[PDB]
Design a protein around this ligand. Sequence first.
Ligand code: HEM
Length: 374
Amino acid sequence: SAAYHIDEEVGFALPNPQENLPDFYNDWMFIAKHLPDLIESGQLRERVEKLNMLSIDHLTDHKSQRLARLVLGCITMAYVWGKGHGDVRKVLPRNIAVPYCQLSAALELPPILVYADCVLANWKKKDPNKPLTYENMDVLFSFRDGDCSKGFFLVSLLVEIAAASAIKVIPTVFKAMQMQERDTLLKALLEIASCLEKALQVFHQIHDHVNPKAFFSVLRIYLSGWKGNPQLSDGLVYEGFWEDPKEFAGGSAGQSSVFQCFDVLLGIQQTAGGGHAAQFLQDMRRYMPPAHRNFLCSLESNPSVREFVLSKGDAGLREAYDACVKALVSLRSYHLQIVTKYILIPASQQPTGGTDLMNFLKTVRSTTEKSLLK
Ligand code: HEM
């Protein structure tokens, strides 16, 4: 749906992201485009600290604000984490923190790099006349040489793009229920499951483009936040904007709207409960663009697909409904192998609670498989 900033082609991802800010913002852009060099040489913090404060007034459209959020988000992670080996900063200087906080308040996102910045808005086609394939795409920003950010961001992006093909069927589903069109609804469900199965294959590409040590020991350090982090146990001081430090979670992949989109579509009850899984999942919506926050809530408000399928004593409908449910399980099962490869093992070889992170993921999967109708 157009009202919810959902693209037919790229889904939750931002269509054709802007690459240039107005010349007014060059001092930001130059720092962001040169993070690998500036961090390596140990100059990044000096360059940030001698920035003047630039007003956000000259950002004139949504895409401009998205790019500015990406630029400032990347500079922030780099400033806080520096070279990525424990020498941190607890005060984001006034001349970044104030405009970053104002912009974030206008976009209804927290002042930290999130998935919608470093993945959904961080990309370009190399040649626009060619399709959305890895070898024709690129990211706009990276942190360090050899951080594998192009691989992680683009493959996450390509999964979002694959899911878009299922997302665009969702309106067909609800109207089918409202028009009592049994065959249309069944075809629609099968199509969604098929597209979700194609999204699972896209996920396999991460092995070709992301290397585990680089991810765990470099990229993951720059995507880390300051909520419950002993390195910044009190959060980050956004100097000149809030007096006391604030805590925000790191820009994980867990901020995608794709799994939750189909959770609520299928009536899978992840957000219900007091447990640590519901709270974490519901907390992650805070980090999704407000338009996508609204989309998930609208879906939660429409009549239940699950109640519809169970009401009709239709084996065809249940089997198609289940095909969607299983594809969602398969995604989470595969995603679990990915976390094992890219976090658990590299951590075990010395450096992510380990077991408490896995049970969370296993819980969400288990909750998902329990929803099968059989
Ligand atoms: C190297 C690849 C990846 C790693 C290491 C990774 C890591 C993680 C981690 C650690 C969590 C637990 C919560 C947290 O981050 O604190 C998580 C959950 C999650 N991840 Fe990823 N992720 C990766 C790729 C992806 C991709 C590509 C997607 C989506 C396209 C994704 C979607 C999710 C979702 C939705 C959750 C929340 C749990 C759920 O909905 O079932 N992840 N991931």
